[PDB]
Amino acid sequence: GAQVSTQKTGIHYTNINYYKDAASNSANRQDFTQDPGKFTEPVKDIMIKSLPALN
Amino acid sequence: GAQVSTQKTGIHYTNINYYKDAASNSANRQDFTQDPGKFTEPVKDIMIKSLPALN
Amino acid sequence: KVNSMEAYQIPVRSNEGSGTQVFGFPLQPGYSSVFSRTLLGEILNYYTHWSGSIKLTFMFCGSAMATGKFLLAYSPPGAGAPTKRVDAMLGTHVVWDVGLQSSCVLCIPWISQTHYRYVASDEYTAGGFITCWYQTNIVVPADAQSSCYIMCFVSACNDFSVRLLKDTPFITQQNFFQ
Amino acid sequence: GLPTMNTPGSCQFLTSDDFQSPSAMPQYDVTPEMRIPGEVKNLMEIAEVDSVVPVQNVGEKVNSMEAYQIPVRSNEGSGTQVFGFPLQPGYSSVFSRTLLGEILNYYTHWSGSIKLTFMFCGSAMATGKFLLAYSPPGAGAPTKRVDAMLGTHVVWDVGLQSSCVLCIPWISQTHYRYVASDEYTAGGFITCWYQTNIVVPADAQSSCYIMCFVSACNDFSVRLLKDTPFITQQNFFQ
Amino acid sequence: AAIGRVADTVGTGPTNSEAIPALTAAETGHTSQVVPGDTMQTRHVKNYHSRSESTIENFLCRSACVYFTEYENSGAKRYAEWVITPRQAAQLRRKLEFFTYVRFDLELTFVITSTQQPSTTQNQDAQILTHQIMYVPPGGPVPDKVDSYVWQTSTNPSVFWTEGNAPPRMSIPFLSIGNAYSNFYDGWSEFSRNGVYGINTLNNMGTLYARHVNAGSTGPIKSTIRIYFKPKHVKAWIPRPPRLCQYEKAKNVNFQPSGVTTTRQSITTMTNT
Amino acid sequence: ACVYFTEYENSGAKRYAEWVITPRQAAQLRRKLEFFTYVRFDLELTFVITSTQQPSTTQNQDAQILTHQIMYVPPGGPVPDKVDSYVWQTSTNPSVFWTEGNAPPRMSIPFLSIGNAYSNFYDGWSEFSRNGVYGINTLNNMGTLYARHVNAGSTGPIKSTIRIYFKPKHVKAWIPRPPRLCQYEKAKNVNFQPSGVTTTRQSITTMTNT
Amino acid sequence: GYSDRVRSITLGNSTITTQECANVVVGYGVWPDYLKDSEATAEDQPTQPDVATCRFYTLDSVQWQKTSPGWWWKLPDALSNLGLFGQNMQYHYLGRTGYTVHVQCNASKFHQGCLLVVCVPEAEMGCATLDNTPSSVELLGGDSAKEFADKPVASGSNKLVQRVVYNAGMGVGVGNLTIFPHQWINLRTNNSATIVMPYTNSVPMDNMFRHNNVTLMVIPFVPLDYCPGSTTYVPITVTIAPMCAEYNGLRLAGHQ
Amino acid sequence: GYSDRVRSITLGNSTITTQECANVVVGYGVWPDYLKDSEATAEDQPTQPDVATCRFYTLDSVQWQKTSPGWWWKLPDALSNLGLFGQNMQYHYLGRTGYTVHVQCNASKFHQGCLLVVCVPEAEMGCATLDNTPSSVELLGGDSAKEFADKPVASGSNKLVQRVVYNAGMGVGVGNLTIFPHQWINLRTNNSATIVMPYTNSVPMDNMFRHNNVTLMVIPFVPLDYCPGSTTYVPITVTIAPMCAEYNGLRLAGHQ
Numbered sequence A, B: 001g002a003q004v005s006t007q008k009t010g011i012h013y014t015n016i017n018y019y020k021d022a023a024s025n026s027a028n029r030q031d032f033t034q035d036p037g038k039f040t041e042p043v044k045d046i047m048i049k050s051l052p053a054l055n
Numbered sequence C: 001k002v003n004s005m006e007a008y009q010i011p012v013r014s015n016e017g018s019g020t021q022v023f024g025f026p027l028q029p030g031y032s033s034v035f036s037r038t039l040l041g042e043i044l045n046y047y048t049h050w051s052g053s054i055k056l057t058f059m060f061c062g063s064a065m066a067t068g069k070f071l072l073a074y075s076p077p078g079a080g081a082p083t084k085r086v087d088a089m090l091g092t093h094v095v096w097d098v099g100l101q102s103s104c105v106l107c108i109p110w111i112s113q114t115h116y117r118y119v120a121s122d123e124y125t126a127g128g129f130i131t132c133w134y135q136t137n138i139v140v141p142a143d144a145q146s147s148c149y150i151m152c153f154v155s156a157c158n159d160f161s162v163r164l165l166k167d168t169p170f171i172t173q174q175n176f177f178q
Numbered sequence D: 001g002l003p004t005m006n007t008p009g010s011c012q013f014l015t016s017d018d019f020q021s022p023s024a025m026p027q028y029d030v031t032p033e034m035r036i037p038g039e040v041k042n043l044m045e046i047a048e049v050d051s052v053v054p055v056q057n058v059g060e061k062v063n064s065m066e067a068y069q070i071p072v073r074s075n076e077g078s079g080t081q082v083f084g085f086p087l088q089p090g091y092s093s094v095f096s097r098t099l100l101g102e103i104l105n106y107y108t109h110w111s112g113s114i115k116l117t118f119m120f121c122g123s124a125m126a127t128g129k130f131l132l133a134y135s136p137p138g139a140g141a142p143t144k145r146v147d148a149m150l151g152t153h154v155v156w157d158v159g160l161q162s163s164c165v166l167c168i169p170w171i172s173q174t175h176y177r178y179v180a181s182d183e184y185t186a187g188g189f190i191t192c193w194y195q196t197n198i199v200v201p202a203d204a205q206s207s208c209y210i211m212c213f214v215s216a217c218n219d220f221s222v223r224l225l226k227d228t229p230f231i232t233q234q235n236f237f238q
Numbered sequence E: 001a002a003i004g005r006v007a008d009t010v011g012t013g014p015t016n017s018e019a020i021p022a023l024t025a026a027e028t029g030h031t032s033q034v035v036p037g038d039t040m041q042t043r044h045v046k047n048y049h050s051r052s053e054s055t056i057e058n059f060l061c062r063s064a065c066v067y068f069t070e071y072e073n074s075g076a077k078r079y080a081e082w083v084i085t086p087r088q089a090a091q092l093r094r095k096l097e098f099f100t101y102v103r104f105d106l107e108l109t110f111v112i113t114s115t116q117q118p119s120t121t122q123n124q125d126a127q128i129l130t131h132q133i134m135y136v137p138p139g140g141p142v143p144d145k146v147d148s149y150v151w152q153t154s155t156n157p158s159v160f161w162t163e164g165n166a167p168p169r170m171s172i173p174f175l176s177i178g179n180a181y182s183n184f185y186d187g188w189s190e191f192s193r194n195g196v197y198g199i200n201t202l203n204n205m206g207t208l209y210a211r212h213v214n215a216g217s218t219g220p221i222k223s224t225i226r227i228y229f230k231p232k233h234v235k236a237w238i239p240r241p242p243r244l245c246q247y248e249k250a251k252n253v254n255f256q257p258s259g260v261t262t263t264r265q266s267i268t269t270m271t272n273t
Numbered sequence F: 001a002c003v004y005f006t007e008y009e010n011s012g013a014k015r016y017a018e019w020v021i022t023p024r025q026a027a028q029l030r031r032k033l034e035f036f037t038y039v040r041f042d043l044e045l046t047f048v049i050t051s052t053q054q055p056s057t058t059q060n061q062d063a064q065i066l067t068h069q070i071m072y073v074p075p076g077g078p079v080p081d082k083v084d085s086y087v088w089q090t091s092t093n094p095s096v097f098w099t100e101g102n103a104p105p106r107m108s109i110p111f112l113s114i115g116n117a118y119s120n121f122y123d124g125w126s127e128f129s130r131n132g133v134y135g136i137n138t139l140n141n142m143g144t145l146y147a148r149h150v151n152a153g154s155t156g157p158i159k160s161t162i163r164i165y166f167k168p169k170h171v172k173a174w175i176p177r178p179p180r181l182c183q184y185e186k187a188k189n190v191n192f193q194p195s196g197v198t199t200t201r202q203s204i205t206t207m208t209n210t
Numbered sequence G, H: 001g002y003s004d005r006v007r008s009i010t011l012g013n014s015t016i017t018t019q020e021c022a023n024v025v026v027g028y029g030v031w032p033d034y035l036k037d038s039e040a041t042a043e044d045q046p047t048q049p050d051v052a053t054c055r056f057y058t059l060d061s062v063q064w065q066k067t068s069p070g071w072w073w074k075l076p077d078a079l080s081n082l083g084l085f086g087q088n089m090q091y092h093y094l095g096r097t098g099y100t101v102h103v104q105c106n107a108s109k110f111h112q113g114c115l116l117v118v119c120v121p122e123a124e125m126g127c128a129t130l131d132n133t134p135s136s137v138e139l140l141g142g143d144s145a146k147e148f149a150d151k152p153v154a155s156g157s158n159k160l161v162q163r164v165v166y167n168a169g170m171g172v173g174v175g176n177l178t179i180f181p182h183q184w185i186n187l188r189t190n191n192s193a194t195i196v197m198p199y200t201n202s203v204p205m206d207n208m209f210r211h212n213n214v215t216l217m218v219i220p221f222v223p224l225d226y227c228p229g230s231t232t233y234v235p236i237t238v239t240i241a242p243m244c245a246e247y248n249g250l251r252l253a254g255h256q
């Protein structure tokens, strides 16, 4: 049982893990998740862009 | 998931991409498209061979 | 001043005129000493190409009683850096009026002939000039300091990206540390 | 000829590799298996079995059964310490050569609660109560009974049930501890005290012994396989 | 958009309301979310730029030489030894230190090269060299000589390599005793706040030992072993300011006060001077 | 196509090589690429690394197998000043390590342009004043390549040559142009020495190439 | 969380902000807009530079001194040399525009004064010498204010402007200038003044050099005043942005 | 009738109020909370004093002088001697907490300055002498700020801290301290700064004396300044409140 993912472009590729340890697998170079909020905007009260930050 | 194309002749071959980047794939040696018009014949008014080019 | 908090201070004070430049640096998030060591700049320096708009947030740290308006401007390359206010306002700009809202943003829109720019220096990849001017001079009352400071924050926009991973010039050594 | 391309690691010989290799005895018929009592599947099966701890390393005693004896006797007071060793199942000389310790010494990390079973080998007529305690690190080893009872403890009362257990709960800031010594991985101090001194009748020996057994609990595990320091040589034996 | 695509530019027109995207208050600790269209008429732009090369994984996933020593055919130093650490090299160390805590598997690669030493030995005829790298986890017997029993490695993991072949390589799991490798540790090793201080109180990654297996020739040969690290399956938490001052010592963050940046003439000079 | 090659030695003055990346130092490939104004393609890189023992008076030489290191430094990155500079750490710079005897090292490279296509010609300047640089070279900022040995090998002196080959893959070309007629003169511009339109012949009636 | 004191205006590659404005006065209720086909005469395809011409042009500042009588700027004119808006004026016979006029002037809780920002359409001016008419050089100041006079201007065969402030150089009560789109910058509560002016004229389009359909005037009714200690240089800056600018009758440049 | 300028926080028998705060920064978006059973190792029943330990502890004030470089406090430490929170640290091997850090500092419409309140997790510090590591006494100030230096600190076989402010004693750009939960007290608009910090560390719990997972730093980027007449002593007070404090591994007291 192989897997089949998408390559990087502007097609797919096949992968078969050969080792009993996950540590042996290739890198996870395609995790494109993003969550800036944790850093930019860690305010308790939501700040609405178009509004004044203070009133 | 491999692919299967036709070889050059006057039969097929199997291909499996092994890398995560399309840049790593083999050449695209079988694109036989052709469009001479862009170069030979870039006239705005269609010129009909059997006709006179000027009248 | 690079060896003190003063490096992060932008001098502003009441004058006997307006139009006076307040500062001016280029749009070289990667190269210019102004940005190069920033959070944004540090990251850029691990890459070869960059693209995207940039935000320059300006916080007025004068006193509650101090007032005034400044002209934050961005002039794309092609001509020289504007030398007079009347020439900078001909470009992309924001007239910031100081008030209860301490900070104000000058969004530097990514205008460029190519999709990406070099993080390193290169005139093809020229990015233009960012300058500030006095729109209507600082005006404090008596008993309120007439000389103030303005801080400048920088960060990337949601359309910012970086390419071609490389090593930073900013870190070096001569022998394995012991 | 299938186009191939060797990668780093090729041709090497990792001691812990795991590959297939041709048999030198093609079609050899192995001897059929047989039911042999006591099979072992995991070393932890062994580490869960009590073994007598040598609490009394003191001097020359290590060369006699005395190493496994814990001196207890009637006193003219209570509060007296009876023993005290650290929680270093791997390093401390007290544990290091134990069944548990021997195993730990083939690994780098350990985790889990430990059981210290104490058997009173006095005489049927001898009585008394002891305070078995475990003080997590952070402060020093308790020096008085009144300071040890402030920690995790079990007041054992000797009686028909000869043995009593002090379960040393795995308290620690990390999931695992080093088998080797390291202060980050500090494990605390295990001490015993007299709760109510030994009290025998006449014609019954007032000086006794207490044995100490150690074994792992069901939440014990070990990681990172390594070689023991406990075995060495200078030349291939003849 | 496309998982990793970047935001597209929303076309905007003339405004004249009381909406104030441009006015905010940095004191909040909040970073402004303004975009071009907020302070100027913009056109619409379908942006296809990806942030693929900025993932924590792609950023830390490149082999990096973190150290290297040498051992010789014969003489005094016949075998090498190195207390494992990523802080002796500055390149990789500065990247990892971009984050407070980190977790990852590691791809190890070794570049082993030999060089003939100058001597006066007649007719030298070297045989192919075979090396042995061996890892000794904290607590295990150490080799005291190139022919110590310890190189038996009944349990210690070790690689045997022969010059000419591809660099030896192997994967290593996330070996921390904790839930993540710590890059910084503002604490001590003793509860009295004595003993060691800083990152090095947590480093107990054991030692690496290299040696030849055969002497090869009658002449003297020196071998260099380069150790490369390559983080795989990375997870990083709490980003921090990038290292500014050059590195001074390998077991602590000690530095020599540095200026905030390079200088320039005046706050009006468009040049780096 | 071999687009360039330099050498670096075991010891001495030049112990490491360096080359500002360019396809215009070789004439073969350059004339083909210049068949079109703009071009876009990925590139298959191949390196042929060979060594040769230098003549000296060193007694009993006994070379160990050579291991080389090629390293790419994108515009803006620290450069090596000596064969043992910290820069060869390559924590981030991409680099290959090769050992003599093995097949030529090889690797793929994406279309690296800052624009939507590589430009083969550029009738413009680098300055808005129409000063500074002129021509194709104002766009070339492909960085530098650096080679070196990793080990000295023997006591004797050895010289190594590194041949760089380019192979365009996934090609797209636009606006064909006349093939280069005049021989190439310089690598950073189209400067030429006026040439005749073709070889000659006797008269417009001669069926022979004379 | 909303205050009419705050506001922001974007036009082209330029944005303006205020944290102490009044409302925003919109012309005669009309908002600028291009010329409708049923209201045009010029038959040629007009040009609408849009972002290139309808942006914020910041003029030369001016000092408000305890005695300043006031200033004024002819509008088609005040920008005739600024960017492409000017270039289009020079190259075209016909032009048509509206403007977002923004007058800035901050002081402090301790200063005082009250300016009158007003857009006067068709502000024909009088002459000091009753037998002549002011000269171009005396009326137009292009991007640099023109000052009003604290007191009358003498006759004497000159082509000067009767700049007496209380007469607005038009021979009318200065205090009746309110029938024109206006706002008051009263340093006490105010800080800026914004006025959007729709194209005004008796014809669809007109030549931008030969005619100045609107004239911006700033005139203090309550003079600036502070106290020893408070800063003394309180400038007044004017920013104007063309709106829906159209140009017809293209030909060779030059304002000849 | 609602203003984000006003706010009030209650934790235990203590309440805090502000009429001029900014927002409230919440850690890395995470809000403090006890340790989940699937994330623990310490097998013993923890102790949650709650109201007795998670209250507002007000530290020693500090004077902000026109030249003050800045201050800092190691967090597990700054409270190690305050109330039962401290008593629990002394009596337990393991502890885990988050904090609501509140930095107060009022001035007046006439003063000026801008502090940078920041919570730096794992703030390991450098030494003046490159061969040693700062001593406990030089790093920890427990409930009394530690000052940063206006200029470098000399070497010379001592165990001092390289307190040079623009380097935050960590060898990094002080102006990049923003990647950490922070707020800015800009006397002009601000007046206090509030930051809620979730427990951070590479392990579920840790010993509170041997380790200081967070370090609070206040650093003026814009120095205090006023005028003859305005008061001169402008203090800065720090109040910190533990949140969801848990303790394991009970034993005899003492921070030995």
Ligand SMILES: CCCCCCCCCCCCCCCC(=O)O
Residues within 6 Å of the ligand: E084, E085, E086, E106, E108, E133, E134, E135, E157, E158, E159, E172, E175, E181, E182, E199, E202, E203, E204, E205
């Ligand atoms: C032949 C087997 C070799 C095994 C190589 C083991 C190397 C261990 C690597 C540990 C990685 C980086 C950790 C820094 C440690 C710390 O400071 O906590």
Ligand SMILES: CCCCCCCCCCCCCCCC(=O)O
Residues within 6 Å of the ligand: F021, F022, F023, F043, F045, F070, F071, F072, F094, F095, F096, F109, F112, F118, F119, F136, F139, F140, F141, F142
């Ligand atoms: C070890 C990594 C090596 C990487 C090799 C990178 C080589 C870059 C090739 C660029 C290609 C041809 C471009 C001509 C450039 C121009 O004139 O615009």
